[PDB]
């Protein structure tokens, strides 16, 4: 008979196919809270991150829509709609704060103390950077500073390991550079250090591809397109 861990992993993949990512999250958390000294397999670790990226991702999209609407109704001085919109937004933000705190507790409690290779250390620290950065995207004032500070500590810990342990062409490292640069551009409003970081990750990858090739080419070339996309539209905005 299969173990609970096997059946939770199987349910999670059923949850992903039915597109019920909340329950996908719950199943993958049962797997994580059942760990001893060992760490998640690449597969389970990617199932956890896909679950959470899709739960948070639906709220982020909702937040963005409700924010743009509120910015329009502010533009007309239509306060009653504005107050309704903001109660709605505040509710979406309460979910964002809960989803983030779920994964962020897991990461510090189970996942990061189990990481045993460079691959997973970077993977979990970058995911800690990511979810502190989703908080930053909507927090204001004192709360925003704390998020941004947490984000920067996590991404820099990730990158100290990534640049010393993974190849320039590794998708988790390229993904880290991609997000770290986005954090400089959109949270810290620093286009100078966004481009320096993004373009340096791209150039070290190109250099490795030109001399050594790489394995898992599929994933990296697309993140590399992402890097180049953000770069060419960041640098058109500095000029334009």
């Amino acid at each position: 008979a299969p173990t609970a861990r096997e059946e939770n992993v199987y349910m999670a993949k059923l949850a992903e196919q039915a597109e019920r990512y909340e329950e996908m999250v719950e199943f993958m958390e049962k797997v994580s809270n059942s760990l001893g000294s060992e760490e998640l397999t690449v597969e389970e670790r990617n199932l956890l991150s896909v679950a959470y990226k899709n739960v948070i991702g639906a709220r982020r999209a909702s937040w963005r829509i409700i924010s743009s609407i509120e910015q329009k109704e502010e533009s007309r001085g239509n306060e009653e709609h504005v107050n309704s919109i903001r109660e709605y937004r505040s509710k979406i933000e309460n979910e964002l704060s809960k989803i983030c705190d779920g994964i962020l507790k897991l990461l510090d409690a189970k996942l990061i103390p189990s990481a045993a290779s460079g691959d997973s250390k970077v993977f979990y620290l970058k995911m800690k950077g990511d979810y502190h950065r989703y908080l930053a995207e909507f927090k204001t004032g004192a709360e925003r500073k704390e998020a941004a500070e947490s984000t920067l500590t996590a991404y820099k810990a990730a990158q100290d390991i990534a640049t010393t342990e993974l190849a320039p062409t590794h998708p988790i490292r390229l993904g880290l550079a991609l997000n770290f640069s986005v954090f400089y551009y959109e949270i810290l409003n620093s286009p100078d250090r966004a481009c320096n970081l993004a373009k340096q990750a791209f150039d070290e990858a190109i250099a490795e591809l030109d001399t050594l090739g790489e394995e898992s080419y599929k994933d990296s070339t697309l993140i590399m397109q992402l890097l180049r996309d953000n770069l060419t539209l960041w640098t058109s905005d500095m000029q334009d």
């Binding site: 990511d130 986005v182 551009y185 992402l226 996309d229 953000n230 539209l233």
Partner: peptide, 5 residues
Amino acid sequence: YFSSN
């Protein structure tokens, strides 16, 4: 809103 991994 920019591209992120």
